């Protein structure tokens, strides 16, 4: 089997660092992408940003100046951070994950299993 | 994801499978303008050292800029440069260079459309008129020439530093410069144009995770100096079809094992290189040149690709199949040489030539009979023929051996055509048709000889 | 980027009647690489993360249940559930990953 | 000015016309000369990182005349390197170095004659061995070694530079290198240098115009690094014809347009590549590489031109006048290809492949039939077949189509030769006469079975 | 020593002599390693402009290990690296990189034996690593963050710059580099490597002698970026066999004399180019690109020769012999063509064309006949064929014109063959007596119109 | 019809900088080359350097160190300076113009309308 586990505070003062840390068990991260969707309660899921099989990253336009994910393929771990949190991007964050270069990749398949994040002081 | 390479000694020909390719099918053209400055007057008098040699880098500037010009004056500096040239032509149109500045003002990046009615971004690499204008140029305006910080010196080194690798490398060039370099266009640069590309996601991963075969694949063309703005077109490449199934056949000549000199007649599939699925039919790329290799992914360039119908596949497997016509050559020299494929080798041993297959710790392990064999790329790390050694390569994965009655045995050495460099198998088949009936007109002589 | 416009909101319904939800994309969603089209159908459980129910809006994920299959081309998909249950109250979202990633409303069940 | 290409369909040809060319006929040699210090010893005692810095910089200046010394043992390193390896031997006897040293001791630029009998200029581009002595060389005599200023270190550097990235380009490319860098000749005193030649203004004024293409042909022969004198060859080019005119010939496939295959042959004049006018004859040059195109003004080099009679100018109007015996090639592959000519584009459809035209707001514009077919270059921009894509150049000029009944036509397949390379229009007309007394024999062999 | 050139005018072929050689038969790799530092982190809080400027050399550090990481990323990056890719794959391996990384603590070279079972010695070039940690680091840890003076910031560019220089070749080469830059392994570290490696002390005396070549032939395979440490394959060339004799041979053109064209038949031997002893038999090289050639040794390399037996030599002096069966063209077209030859050179002159030998100072001095005919390197400086010139090079040793009847007369045209890319004597003999054998039955049937 | 105008100063002190400017109407200076011939009084013609089409230059030998001709095409403008004048250089300036590479068209068939330059304090 695979499975996702999420580590981090999720309580965080207004306009400050948040950092997760999502360590990866069942596969290798030299091959699954990792992606990063964020549901705010009550509303659906927003995507913010990706991070491929070769290190490089795609954000969020919206984040892209705040939003940082990086990847470490040694110990299977993948990391991000966001700055400048403000009281709007209280959420639930899944560092869910990715296939190939193909649709048959199951999508967003294996999800974690969601860290609460409440933005407040 | 698996590479099983399949040798078939009915051809003896090596044919991969498994491959994941990605054919280039556009390209897309991003305006890298340099903010420079139009300073040519020196006023401040100062004999300083550290002044002569802020002086001297104004002066390379300043030789730079000609250079430019110069190159501007070589502008327009297929399928290549065009839409370079077009997007050079249209910034020498009134006002275009003034949108693209007015545009880039606010951010270092932006997407402008242009009076051709192509929108393309802009990216402003280096923003020199700034650096200039606000810190060198006022201490070269007052007559004092005042530099008591020789850091900047350098620090406008380093400024200037790019630029003159941008001219230098366009110098020799004549303003097309490939590869591009990490000074036309910076790595970081380039990962973050690709996310701002117009594309799939599929796009950006694929050329996100291999980003050197697309500086390898870059064009970088000489635009314009003009109204205090350089800008060249980075031309990048553009993957419509990605992780298609795409397989390389490797062929080596098959001659008769014939001890007597004179009768080898060799015959060499030439539909040799790199065959790749998209919108239903074979890209083929005859030259090894076009199509990079990574570790499974066979990027190409359809720039000189053919388009062919599926069934040429079945002519891999299958060499007198209806549906497919493959292509083949008939010589006569009959020279013992090797192939190292994925998988394995190739060896073509004939006449007196001693071939041999060899181990880093067994030492030689194998000896080669005549006639065209294949040897597994485990356990076998060299051979040598003759007096030449080919390594064999020690690439993972699984290797088939198909028993296969050589297609040469079959045609007669007699009547075998000689040097044809590109044939077919209908083809081959109508000239041995010509050539028997040439034979049977002959024996229609001796009959009417014999009666008459 | 692609909108997605899911309806209806809500759709309340009773055990063992049929649910049908429509999706439309903003453009189309088909691929001219591998002649596929890029959405996919997601089922959330209150309290539970999203489960990957259908991509291509036709290929179930594997251990799902055969009630949901739904259909579509172009730019109008349907998610069809043949037997609700009364455990399959859920939120149901579609979504599209060929331009960028984003997602619909939220197709709301609720049994009676 | 105006070019005029005249595309006929009888050939399916497409020639370029109105280009003023500018032959290149033979070369001048420069003796570029840098000023060295014969320095090897230290005296200097510092450990100040300063110091470290300008006894690193000396070691890497040592270390590059030691490479220097090196390609020099490589030394002597058609008409390519002869000038230079002269006036590298002649460098090597007594005395000639000497006498360049003691003439440009006033002077950056000087014509010196040699014992060969030949005068050339002498460049003394770079003063290094003033710099070293009067400035570095007191700083390492004195016991005290205090290197003054920070600037004298970076102006040592920067001089240095130039030196050393002339060894690093000479021994990756083992003393000779081309194109001539800015670092083996800057552009300024190139420009500097074309003034002294002895030519005429024409060729001024010519070289001035162009200094790209005089970089592409140029060359820069290492010779001889002795008696503080790093001396190399550069040997830059001299146009004896200016304003010549030069015509581009492209050609394609021309096929039969039947369905069936085995019976398309292909016919596709092998003369194809540029043709000047000199001295009342033609200089044809086949390949491509070595004619640059500039702005209608097309520059050439005449070591791999073929001199030619002028009648083979009726040959691009006429193929089967009698003057010139144009050449072909006859092959039987009717692959659908396009080549991209100057004011459009020739494309060749044949079989069952696709070949479209198109402009980028009107979309798809036009569908090709069988044979060879012209396109300009206005109101359409791109032409896709099968499954590649290719451009038309964005020229302006006047283009002119002429109907033409294809040559394929009057060529009976039966009889039409195959595989054929460079052929010509009376070598393919009796071998097909042969082939007919082939069949005219014949027809006395049932004439045979006839008559007995 | 003496070059002994002999131009058969038979086939009017040169033949140089007295050659020198130093073949290339094997490859050692030497595992060339960078020390790197693993720093991520600033925490400097300085905004002077020397800290800004260390700040940015540190980034350009760090982009140029992000860069290596991806080229790690397109390893593994046909015996040129087959050898060299297999110690990537090696230092892959758990413990493979930390058992170099301690032996070479004490010792900047070390011989490391690896898992393979192969020991390979390992050159540390550049330790980073110990002046990033020592000097620049302890400044970055502190708060204050004071560069002692620019002349730190200096260094540290100087420093930086050779792996800045070697991540661009790398990035632009996609890893695989050469000829081996300056950059990849300075000239004294590579004759240190030389001395170190394991070879016959001829091997040392011939590779210390000419480095140039070495380079040339070297290579540069990127293996690996991990765990502080940045390790290439430098694998240079590795010369089995030094001072055999070889010889090269230069052929021209030989075709009628009959000024009515289309009766020209000619023949040119196409087994020109480059021969040298080895065990006993010849490696021949078909192409003189890789026989690089000193003054009098000419270096080669076998990864693309061919073995022959001995007895090919007697076919230079005797193309008749039953011992070997020599390779020649027959071909149609007679340009008239020149060939530059070490001591002179071979001038093919047929129809209309004109062909004059000329001396610097005496002028025009002697008009070609038809025919190929030799003229040697002194008395003679230049030779003007049409439009087109080329030299003679002024090389010193004798030279011997031989009489020679030309073997073309030997041959009928009528029955002649036309464009063989490689034929053989026996081969044009064989067809010869097919067509006397098809012209004797056609005989035949003229006489049975007779007979009855 | 085609012209030049010549202006700036002819009248300046001897061993200073003396400048004009000839401003071309009725053609392109990207292809008409422009000379600038000298006449002192009682004395034919001598030649003062030229500027190509390109913008390269090629000075006469003798004024090669302190001749200087520039020109630019946007505004189709010729500017000449010399440096040391001396009263040896009193004389009649013309910005007479060129024509091709192939010589077949008015070598210097337009000339200015001439400017006096007397040299003296």
């Known amino acids: 089997q695979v499975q996702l586990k999420q580590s981090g505070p999720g309580l965080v003062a207004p306009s400050q660092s948040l950092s997760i840390t999502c360590?990866?068990?069942?596969?290798?991260?030299?091959?699954?992408?990792?992606?990063?969707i964020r549901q705010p309660p009550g509303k659906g899921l927003e995507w913010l940003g990706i991070i491929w099989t070769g290190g490089g990253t795609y954000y969020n336009s919206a984040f892209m100046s705040r939003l940082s994910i990086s990847k470490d393929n040694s110990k299977s771990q993948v990391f991000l951070e966001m700055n400048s949190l403000q009281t709007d991007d209280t959420a639930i964050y899944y560092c869910v994950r990715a296939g190939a270069d193909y649709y048959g990749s199951s999508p967003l398949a294996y999800w974690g299993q969601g860290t609460l994040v409440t933005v407040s002081s | 994801q698996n590479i099983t390479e399949e040798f078939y000694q009915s051809t003896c020909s090596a044919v991969s499978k498994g491959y994941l390719g990605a054919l280039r099918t556009g390209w897309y053209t991003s305006v890298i303008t340099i903010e420079l400055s139009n300073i040519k007057k020196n006023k401040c008098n100062g004999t300083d050292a550290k002044i002569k040699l802020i002086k001297q880098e104004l002066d390379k500037y300043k030789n730079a800029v000609t250079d430019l010009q110069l190159l501007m004056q070589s502008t327009p500096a297929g399928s290549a440069i065009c839409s370079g040239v077009a997007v050079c032509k249209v910034l020498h149109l009134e006002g275009e260079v003034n949108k693209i500045k007015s545009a880039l003002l606010s951010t270092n990046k932006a997407v402008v459309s242009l009076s051709n009615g192509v929108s393309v971004l802009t990216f402003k690499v280096l923003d020199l008129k700034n650096y200039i204008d606000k810190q060198l140029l006022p201490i070269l305006n007052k007559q004092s020439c005042s530099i008591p910080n020789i850091e900047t010196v350098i620090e406008f080194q380093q400024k200037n530093n790019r630029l003159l690798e941008i001219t230098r490398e366009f110098s020799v060039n004549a303003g097309v410069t490939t590869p591009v370099s990490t000074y036309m266009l910076t790595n970081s640069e380039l990962l973050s144009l690709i996310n701002d590309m117009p594309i799939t996601n599929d796009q950006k991963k694929l050329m996100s995770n291999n980003v050197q075969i697309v500086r390898q694949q870059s064009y970088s063309i000489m635009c314009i100096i003009k109204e205090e703005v350089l800008a060249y077109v980075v031309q990048l490449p553009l993957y419509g079809v990605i992780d298609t199934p795409c397989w390389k056949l490797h062929t080596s000549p098959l001659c008769t094992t014939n001890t007597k000199e004179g009768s080898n007649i060799c015959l060499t599939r030439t539909d040799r290189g790199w065959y790749c699925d998209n919108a239903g039919s074979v890209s083929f790329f005859p030259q090894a040149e076009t199509c990079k290799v990574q570790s499974n992914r066979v990027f190409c360039d359809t720039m000189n690709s053919r388009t062919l119908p599926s069934e040429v596949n079945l002519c891999n497997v299958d060499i007198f199949n209806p549906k497919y016509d493959c292509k083949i050559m008939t010589s006569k020299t009959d020279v013992s040489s090797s192939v190292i494929t994925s998988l394995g080798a190739i060896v073509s041993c004939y006449g007196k030539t001693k071939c041999t297959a060899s181990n880093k710790n067994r030492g030689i392990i194998k000896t080669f009979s005549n006639g065209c064999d294949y040897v597994s790329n485990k356990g076998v790390d060299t051979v040598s023929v003759g007096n030449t050694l080919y390594c064999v390569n020690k690439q993972e994965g699984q290797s088939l051996y198909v028993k296969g009655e050589p297609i040469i045995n079959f045609y007669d050495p007699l009547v075998f055509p000689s040097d044809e460099f590109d044939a077919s198998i209908s083809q081959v088949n109508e000239k041995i048709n010509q050539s028997l009936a040439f034979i049977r007109k002959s024996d229609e002589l001796l009959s009417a000889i014999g009666g008459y | 980027d692609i909108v997605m416009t899911q309806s209806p909101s809500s759709l309340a319904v009773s055990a063992g009647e049929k649910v049908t939800m429509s999706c439309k994309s903003s453009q189309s969603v088909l691929n001219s690489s591998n002649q596929k089209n890029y959405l996919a159908w997601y089922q959330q459980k209150p309290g539970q993360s999203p489960k990957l129910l259908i991509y291509w809006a036709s290929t179930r994920e594997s251990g799902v249940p055969d009630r949901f299959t739904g259909s579509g081309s172009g730019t109008d998909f349907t998610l069809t559930i043949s037997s609700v249950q009364a455990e399959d109250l859920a939120v149901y979202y579609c979504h599209q990953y060929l331009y960028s990633y984003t997602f619909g409303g939220g197709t709301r069940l609720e049994i009676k | 000015q105006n070019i005029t290409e005249e595309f006929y369909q009888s050939t399916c040809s497409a020639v370029s016309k109105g280009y003023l060319g500018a032959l290149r006929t033979g070369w001048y040699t420069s003796v570029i000369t840098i000023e060295l210090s014969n320095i090897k010893k230290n005296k200097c005692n510092g450990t100040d990182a300063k110091i470290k810095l300008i006894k690193q910089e000396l070691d890497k200046y040592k270390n590059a005349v030691t490479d220097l010394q090196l390609l020099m043992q490589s030394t002597p390193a058609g008409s390519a390197i002869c000038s230079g390896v002269a006036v590298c031997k002649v460098l090597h006897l007594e005395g000639e170095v000497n006498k360049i040293k003691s003439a440009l001791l006033s002077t950056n630029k000087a014509v010196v004659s040699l014992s060969n009998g030949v005068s050339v200029l002498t460049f003394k581009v770079l003063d290094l061995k003033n710099y070293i002595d009067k400035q570095l060389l007191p700083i390492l005599n004195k016991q005290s070694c205090s290197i003054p200023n920070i600037e004298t270190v970076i102006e040592f550097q920067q001089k240095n530079n130039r030196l050393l990235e002339i060894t690093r380009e000479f021994s990756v490319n083992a003393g000779v290198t081309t194109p001539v860098s800015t670092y083996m000749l800057t552009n300024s005193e190139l420009l500097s240098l074309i003034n002294d030649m002895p030519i005429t203004n024409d060729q001024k004024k010519l070289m001035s115009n162009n200094v790209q293409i005089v970089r592409q042909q140029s060359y820069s022969i290492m010779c001889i690094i002795k008696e503080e004198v790093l001396a190399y060859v550069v040997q830059l080019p001299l146009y004896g014809v200016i304003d010549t005119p030069c015509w581009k010939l492209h050609t394609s496939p021309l096929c039969t347009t039947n369905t069936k295959e085995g019976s398309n042959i292909c016919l596709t004049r092998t003369d194809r590549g540029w043709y000047c006018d000199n001295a009342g004859s033609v200089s044809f040059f086949p390949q491509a590489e070595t004619c640059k195109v500039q702005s209608n003004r097309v520059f050439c080099d005449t070591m791999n031109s073929r001199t030619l009679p002028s009648e083979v100018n009726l040959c691009n109007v006429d193929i089967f006048n009698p003057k010139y015996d144009c050449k072909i090639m006859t092959s039987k592959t009717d692959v659908s290809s396009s080549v991209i000519t100057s004011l459009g584009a020739i494309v060749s459809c044949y079989g069952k492949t696709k070949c479209t035209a198109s402009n980028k707001n009107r979309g798809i514009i036009k569908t090709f039939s069988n044979g060879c077919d012209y396109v300009s270059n206005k109101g359409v921009d791109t032409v896709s077949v099968g499954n590649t894509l290719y451009c038309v150049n964005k020229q302006e000029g006047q283009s002119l189509y002429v109907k033409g009944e294809p040559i394929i036509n009057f060529y009976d397949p039966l009889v039409f030769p195959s595989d054929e390379f460079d052929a010509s229009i009376s070598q393919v007309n009796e071998k097909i006469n042969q082939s007919l007394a082939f069949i005219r024999k014949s027809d006395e062999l049932l004439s045979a079975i006839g008559g007995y | 020593q003496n070059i002994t050139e002999e131009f058969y005018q038979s086939t009017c072929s040169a033949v140089s002599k007295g050659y020198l050689g130093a073949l290339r038969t094997g490859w050692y790799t030497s595992v060339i390693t960078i020390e790197l530092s693993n720093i991520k982190k600033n925490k400097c809080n300085g905004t002077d402009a020397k800290i800004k400027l260390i700040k940015q050399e540190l980034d350009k550090y760090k982009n140029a290990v992000t860069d290596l990481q991806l080229l790690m990323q397109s390893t593994p990056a046909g015996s040129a690296i087959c050898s060299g890719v297999a110690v990537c794959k090696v230092l892959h391996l758990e413990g493979e990189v930390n058992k170099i990384k301690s032996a070479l603590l004490s010792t900047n070279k070390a011989v490391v034996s690896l898992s393979n079972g192969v020991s390979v010695l390992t050159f540390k070039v550049l330790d980073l690593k110990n002046y990033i940690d020592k000097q620049l680091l302890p400044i970055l840890n502190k708060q204050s963050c004071s560069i002692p003076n620019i002349e730190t910031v200096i260094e540290f560019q100087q420093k930086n710059n050779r792996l800045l220089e070697i991540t661009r070749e790398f990035s632009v080469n996609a890893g695989v580099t050469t000829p081996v830059s300056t950059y990849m392994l300075t000239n004294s570290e590579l004759l240190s490597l030389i001395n170190d490696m394991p070879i016959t002390n001829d091997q040392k005396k011939l590779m210390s002698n000419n480095v140039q070549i070495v380079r040339q032939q070297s290579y540069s395979i990127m293996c690996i970026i991990k765990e502080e440490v940045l390790a290439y394959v430098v694998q240079l060339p590795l010369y089995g066999v030094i001072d055999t004799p070889c010889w090269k041979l230069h052929t021209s053109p030989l075709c009628t004399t009959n000024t009515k064209e289309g009766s020209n038949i000619c023949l040119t031997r196409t087994d020109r180019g480059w021969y040298c002893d080895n065990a006993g038999s010849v490696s021949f090289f078909p192409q003189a690109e890789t026989c690089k050639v000193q003054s009098n040794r000419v270096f080669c390399d076998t990864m693309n020769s061919r073995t022959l037996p001995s007895e090919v030599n007697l076919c230079n002096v005797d193309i008749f012999n039953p011992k070997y069966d020599c390779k020649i063209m027959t071909s149609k077209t007679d340009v008239s063509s020149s060939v530059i030859t070490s001591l002179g050179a071979i001038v093919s002159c047929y129809g209309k064309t004109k062909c004059t030998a000329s001396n610097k100072n005496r002028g025009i001095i002697k008009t070609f006949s038809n025919g190929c005919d030799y003229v040697s390197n002194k008395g003679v400086d230049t030779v003007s064929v049409g439009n087109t010139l080329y030299c003679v090079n002024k090389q010193e040793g004798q030279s011997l014109y031989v009489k020679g009847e030309p073997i073309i007369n030997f041959y009928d045209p009528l029955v002649f063959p036309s464009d063989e890319f490689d034929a053989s004597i026996s081969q044009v003999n064989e067809k010869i007596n097919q067509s006397l054998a098809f012209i004797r039955k056609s005989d035949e049937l003229l006489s049975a119109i007779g007979g009855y | 019809q085609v012209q030049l105008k010549q202006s700036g100063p002819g009248l300046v002190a001897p061993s200073q900088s003396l400048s004009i400017t000839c401003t071309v109407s009725?053609?392109?200076?990207?292809?008409?080359?422009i000379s600038w011939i000298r006449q002192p009084p009682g004395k034919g013609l001598e030649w003062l350097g030229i500027i190509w089409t390109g913008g390269g230059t090629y000075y006469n030998s003798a004024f090669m160190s302190r001749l200087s001709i520039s020109k630019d095409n946007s505004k189709s403008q010729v500017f000449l300076e010399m440096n040391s004048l001396q009263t040896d250089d009193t004389a009649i300036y013309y910005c007479v113009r060129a024509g091709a590479d192939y010589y077949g068209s008015s070598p210097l068939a337009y000339w200015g309308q001439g400017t006096l330059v007397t040299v003296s304090s």
């Open positions: 009725g053609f392109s200076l990207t292809n008409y080359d």
